[PDB]
Design a protein around this ligand. Sequence first.
Ligand SMILES: O=P(O)(O)COc1cccc2c1-c1ncsc1C2
Ligand SMILES: O=P(O)(O)COc1cccc2c1-c1ncsc1C2
Ligand SMILES: O=P(O)(O)COc1cccc2c1-c1ncsc1C2
Ligand SMILES: O=P(O)(O)COc1cccc2c1-c1ncsc1C2
Lengths: 318, 318, 319, 318
Amino acid sequence: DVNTLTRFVMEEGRKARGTGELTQLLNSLCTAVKAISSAVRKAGIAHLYGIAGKKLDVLSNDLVMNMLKSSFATCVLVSEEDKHAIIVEPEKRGKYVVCFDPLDGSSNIDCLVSVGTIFGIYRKKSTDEPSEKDALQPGRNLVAAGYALYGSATMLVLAMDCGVNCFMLDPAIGEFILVDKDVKIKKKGKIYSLNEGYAKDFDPAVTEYIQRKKFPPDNSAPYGARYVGSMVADVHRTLVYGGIFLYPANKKSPNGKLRLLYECNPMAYVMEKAGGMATTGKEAVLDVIPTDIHQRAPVILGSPDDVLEFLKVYEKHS
Amino acid sequence: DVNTLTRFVMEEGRKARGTGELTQLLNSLCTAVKAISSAVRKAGIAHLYGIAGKKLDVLSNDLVMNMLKSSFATCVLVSEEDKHAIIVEPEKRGKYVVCFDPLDGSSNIDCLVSVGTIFGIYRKKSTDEPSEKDALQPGRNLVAAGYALYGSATMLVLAMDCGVNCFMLDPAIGEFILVDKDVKIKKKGKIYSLNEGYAKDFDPAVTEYIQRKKFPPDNSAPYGARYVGSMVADVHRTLVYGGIFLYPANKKSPNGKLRLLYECNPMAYVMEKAGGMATTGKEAVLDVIPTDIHQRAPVILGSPDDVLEFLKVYEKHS
Amino acid sequence: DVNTLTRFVMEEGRKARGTGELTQLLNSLCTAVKAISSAVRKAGIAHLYGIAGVKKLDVLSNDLVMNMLKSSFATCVLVSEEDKHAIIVEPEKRGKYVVCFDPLDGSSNIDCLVSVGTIFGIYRKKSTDEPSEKDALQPGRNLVAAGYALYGSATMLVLAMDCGVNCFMLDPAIGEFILVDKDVKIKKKGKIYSLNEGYAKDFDPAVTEYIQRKKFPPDNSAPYGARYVGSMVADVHRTLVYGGIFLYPANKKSPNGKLRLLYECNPMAYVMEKAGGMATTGKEAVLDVIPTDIHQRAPVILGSPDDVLEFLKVYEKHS
Amino acid sequence: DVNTLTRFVMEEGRKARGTGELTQLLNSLCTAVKAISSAVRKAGIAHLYGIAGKKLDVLSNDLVMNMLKSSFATCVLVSEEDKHAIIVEPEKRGKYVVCFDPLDGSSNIDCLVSVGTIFGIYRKKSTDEPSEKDALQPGRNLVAAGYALYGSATMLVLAMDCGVNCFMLDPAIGEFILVDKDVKIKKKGKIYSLNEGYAKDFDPAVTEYIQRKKFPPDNSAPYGARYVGSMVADVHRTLVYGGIFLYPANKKSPNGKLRLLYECNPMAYVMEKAGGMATTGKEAVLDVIPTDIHQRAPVILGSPDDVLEFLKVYEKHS
Ligand SMILES: O=P(O)(O)COc1cccc2c1-c1ncsc1C2
Ligand SMILES: O=P(O)(O)COc1cccc2c1-c1ncsc1C2
Ligand SMILES: O=P(O)(O)COc1cccc2c1-c1ncsc1C2
Ligand SMILES: O=P(O)(O)COc1cccc2c1-c1ncsc1C2
């Protein structure tokens, strides 16, 4: 029996016996994603080049922003594109807070590399007039999170308390088809992913770990290397093939480079629900209590046995 | 003045004042690429999942094969998917020979990583009955070559004697729109791309070069690292952002992993026409005279100053 | 504030405070319509013609609606022009709704690329017995929802419920039905009459006189314009948008008409009434006819109120 | 062997051994039709309705106009949209003249009725400066003509000296697939098409003919009636199913309502090449020598036996 994202979310929402808000929120996000996908695949670019005589990131942000506001399910929106959290006007407020990167990897879009949309959904915990403070909850409080990968094909990975599910976007009918139910990452992988250009600045623990991947002390087979540069792409490969992904702090970016609210937490949540791990080295990413909506955070995630191995090396250096 | 691949190829073909065969050949390939793109983006996948109640590689190979045969411009077809060269039936023979990888990076199409179609076109030099021998020409003989990148968006890079041009596929109207005329790679880049998992088996020259990229002896800024795993994707980034791409040889692989006829030469051709370089370490990729249609060849390509620097290190170890 | 069919139905469903079944049913139907639309516009036809080196559209359309409805868990009895007998949903997928539909109306003529569509009518099962064909035998007046999908120059879904009629345009770029017409109402009177005049020789005197009054206004007004696509979905939609009258009456050879009551007449009748129009068989409101056979025929005259009313006056003159 | 509009036109053009202009013109028209089709099916309408926070006929006219001008194959363009013929700037002139209706039936598009694009191509005869005079040639001089039907599916019917061919537009890959070679209309049909609302003003000949279709002389079965209102739709059904289409001159418009240059001639040309007929009642539509680019002309076309029958009745009343 075929299943779509819409049908899936409707059912899960019905079971929850709530207001139906989250269902509306996700429906809206889904529509936005479809819109972004169309734009990312360059639909209509011929008109831009004069067949008949705004930047992608901006448009993407506008789509998510507008669809979420018009859902009546949110009150506070935090986006990679905006400096301050956006407070939904009173007549359209809902109980959810959403953090997202409308178009991840958009900086290197020129080369047509994969790009994506990452999102994390929280329930407003505070009772004060909505404000940026409502977005400062530890990832552990996420009600739902996931991403949309705009690669060879467009896929939306949705993670909720009940697990992780993958939907393929069928461009023929603009419908997200469920193709992977209750997904689980491999216990251990054979791929490590990180920008080794920072080798000169790596922390000793990271240096040793990578070393153990290239020169297994047990003469096992060396891990293969892959690094697309687009977090959505790299994390998704990790989920599918297993392995490990890293963007640790550089002595140049002491607090890591990736953002906690809309890049780290969402991926961390997806990994954990899929049976994987996500650490900053010192603690689980999901446990970090944010103080600034755009704060950075180091992150090592992927197959449990792999993350655990890194942690062993991390401790050896602490 | 908007320009499409069809219009462009028709005009360049008209100027050549020939049979018009190459024009037909490229038109055919173009249609095939659009077909592949549709399939790659999962159009119709809902039917595969029972909405109404087997492989991409094979389908892609069938599309290029049939479109090329039906163009009446080819006589010998060499495909990464086929063990032997395909000899076009007599009643559909043309004067061109085409070598191609219908779906490059397909081994990893499961994580939705970018994939592409690489192609190289030669003119049959002999009148002997068409045979695999006609595909054994040095890349320097290429009449045209390029690739189709199925990434965030689908793009077709076409290189001919007159230069390199990039066309973006507008899904809305199924038309390839010219968006980059007479492209030229940067003289020097800041990105190095290769699977460092093979570090343990690297040739000393490769090891030292990568080391100079991570720890510049002149204390310059270290190069950034990127490696998608899909040649089309990696080479295209190199073209767009500049830098260097490597898939070198070592003791266990005296001649590399990538294939000369349909992976190395096409990319080598594109690079040279764009002002870049492509070496095997011992000589220009395009100068290698093939003896086997599926023979492998080591390859280092990209920005000239970068390839030249590699060659300096290579020589140091020779 | 942009609005989509999915958002709209979810909202209306939430307000109803029910099981959420109808919401799932409509979502499913909507997905099916998108699928049919894709097929109707010939997506992938290149493969059928050997680009790489395959059933009829009506069949496929029927399969899509059938499967999407069954898989919704909101239905128990499905009636389609395609199947002779009502389909009883297996026990593990039963819902409380009954659906009558024509998966691809006008399909008898898709070779000329004429407009085609999907008509649907939704009823609530009103029995405590094992689901059967009998549950589809309710007068149109019992409809909970009904409408159609028009596959014309663009694909549009007209949805009529107790709260009114709303039109959604299908944006192929994102596969989303965008609300472009809220609480639609047909014109009080139109200037277009639609029917196959080829059957002139067999027309009922009332029909003959009426058409005559449209071509030669007695009060010397301007004669009505004529339009007849042949595809009910197309002709009814034009009537809705431009007003006027549409007819497929009974004749000598066809005493009860040609169109089907359950999935062609009732749905359209329901849509017209909710939009302020009328739908009569000549003897009574289409919606009031109590069916006895799921595939029974019924004559139908529908459209602008003043126009249907005028026909009725002529009909009575001949009774 | 699959065949596309592009491949077909390139081959026929090559055989003609000419400048290649007509090939470029048709390619351009083809791309424009795809663009119009996308617009007609409402692609992107969501943005029009604020998903992210000009008229179809105008856009359609702009697309054809620009694509034709940029083909370098035209010099004089006549469109229903413009009052005066458009003279192509000197630096983009070709030897062809094109008359067209960018979006036929656009007046009643609000009901989603079928719409289409009609076109007629002539070769500039004269040697003087291009002017409106160059579009005043009898249909008999057409080099090519046809239309694009935007119905349940988009189809382009192309008629040239070698016959009539039909191409289905595959939205998945934006390619026109040849699905009907050297088409021929039925010798006689069973459908008559015309707006009977004008009954009160019909010419006696028309009245009698219609009468013979509803109450058959040879005891035969009455013809079925169909009238969409969109010429492109009605003419296409006639071509496919055979029969007759009429828009005669009543008492009011003594010259008919349809336009000769871009509505009647193109259709007339298509019919004749398909073995059908097209008369004004007094003479073959293609034989009428125009004096005004927007002049009207009565027209009765379709199956030969049907047109012939009309003519017999027409003469009885003359
Ligand atoms: O937002 P509400 O409708 O008040 C509650 O919705 C939920 C409460 C708990 C768990 C889930 C949902 C929910 N809504 C849609 S999917 C899903 C999973
Ligand atoms: O195949 P022919 O028409 O005989 C020769 O075509 C060419 C000969 C030389 C250079 C070019 C072409 C050609 N054909 C299409 S683009 C292009 C560039
Ligand atoms: O199927 P139920 O959820 O039990 C009842 O649904 C309804 C009951 C009355 C009115 C409406 C709906 C409904 N469901 C979706 S839109 C809409 C309008
Ligand atoms: O415009 P030219 O290439 O100089 C002449 O083209 C033709 C001359 C006669 C007949 C045909 C063509 C032509 N060009 C494309 S299809 C087709 C049929």
